């Protein structure tokens, strides 16, 4: 029915978007996951546990992405002055510049895919699916 | 902006849904991917290449899922009478019964997550995001 198809359509959109984002982000030497790590750290340092949980990936996947971004000079591991065991992933100036280029790629793609929708239609959809997100996040965890 | 957030919200919804589906489908001894393989074959036999492409996963992931469903007696590998190299994954009666239970789990979860949306609101969203899906599929491949 309708409610089923809304969720299945969201899934198909995500898969297709993920494929294209990986392709376009590739020119920035990033994968979609790498870009998400930069997005997460762009507004403040994040624990690796947070990253894995928030974006639903394995801790090994986060370790791999962070190791990569670190070698690329986009993020750094920050340790507590009294306990270096406590780690936070902090974005670098270079990381922020790359993130900004990535967000622009995202912006352009988003405009393209929603091209059939007028500003108002975009508004209706956003407001409504925002409620779906709130519920599933309350349900799943 | 709005168009960006529509796509990012869709992504968050997908991740959260995926987590919960894996959890609920688990009781049916299935992962979300396994369930998708059953969904794909429920209406007709599918090539393994199709499965990997349609649901954006690696061929090794499909091989693993198909090997599993085959051992579970939910699907079978069908070969051409003149060229056994040509393979199609066909669902079994048991596979269809399990798929049906899976679709019911999906149905209930969908009703829950879209609970804040009235039938009409569900209609508006579906019609509109369907256009987004058409575009991204045209763009990505
Ligand atoms: Ca909860
Ligand atoms: Ca095309």
> What CATH number has the domain bearing residue B6?
1.10.10.10
Question: Experimental method for this entry?
Answer: X-ray
Residues from chain B contacting residue A7 (CB–CB below 8 Å):
13, 17, 106, 109-110, 113-114
Nearest by CB: B4 against A106, A115, A139: A106
- The tally of domains found in chain A comes to 1
Q: How far apart are CA B19 and CA A141, in angstroms?
A: 9
Give me the helix-helix angle, A32-42 and A2-25, nearest 10°. Answer: 90
Residue that has been written with the tokens 């670098």 in this structure:
A92
- Burial class from Cβ neighbours inside 10 Å (0-12, 13-18, 19+) for residue B2 reads middle
Q: For chain A, how many residues are written? A: 141
Q: In angstroms, rounded to a whole number, what is the distance separating the alpha carbons of residues B75 and B67?
A: 9
- HEC string of chain B equals CHHHHHHHHHHHHHHHHHHHHHHHHHHHCCCHHHHHHHHHHHCCCECHHHHHHHCCCCHHHHHHHHHHHHHCCCEEEEECCCCCCCEEEEECHHHHHHHHHHHHHHHHHHHHHCCCCCHHHHHHHHHHHHHHHHHHHHHHC
Tokens describing residue A30:
């990033």
What Å resolution does this PDB entry report?
A: 1.9
Nearest to A39 by CA among B14, B7, B8: B8
Take residue A68 and report the two structure tokens written for it.
């990569």
Distance separating alpha carbons of residues A91 and A86, to the nearest angstrom: 17
Distance CA A40, CA A65 (A): 13
Residue range(s) defining the domain that contains residue B23: 1-141
Interatomic CA distance for residues B29 and B69, integer angstroms:
10
Give me the residues of A, 101-120, that contact B with CB < 8 A. 103, 106-107, 109-117, 119
Q: Kindly list the distances between the CA atom of residue A109 and the CA atoms of A20, A35, B38, in Å, as whole numbers in the listed order.
A: 9, 15, 31
Report the alpha-carbon distance of residue B7 to residue A128 in Å, rounded. Answer: 13
Interface test with A, best of B2, B40, B105, B111 (most A CBs within 10 A): B2
Minimal-distance CA residue of chain B relative to A111: B3
């Amino acid at each position: 029915e309708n409610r089923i198809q809304i969720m299945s359509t969201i899934a198909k959109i995500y898969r297709a978007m993920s494929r294209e984002l990986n392709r376009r982000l590739g020119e920035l030497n990033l994968s979609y996951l790498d870009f998400l790590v930069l997005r997460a750290t762009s507004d403040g340092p994040k624990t690796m546990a947070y990253l894995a949980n928030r974006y639903f990936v394995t801790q090994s996947a986060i370790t791999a992405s962070v190791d990569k971004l670190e070698e690329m000079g986009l993020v750094v591991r920050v340790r507590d002055r009294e306990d270096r065991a406590k780690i936070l992933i902090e974005i670098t100036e270079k990381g922020l510049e790359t993130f900004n280029k990535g967000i622009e790629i995202y912006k352009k793609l988003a405009n393209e895919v929603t091209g059939d929708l007028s500003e108002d239609e975009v508004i209706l959809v956003l407001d409504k699916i925002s409620k779906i997100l709130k519920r599933i996040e309350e349900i799943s965890q």
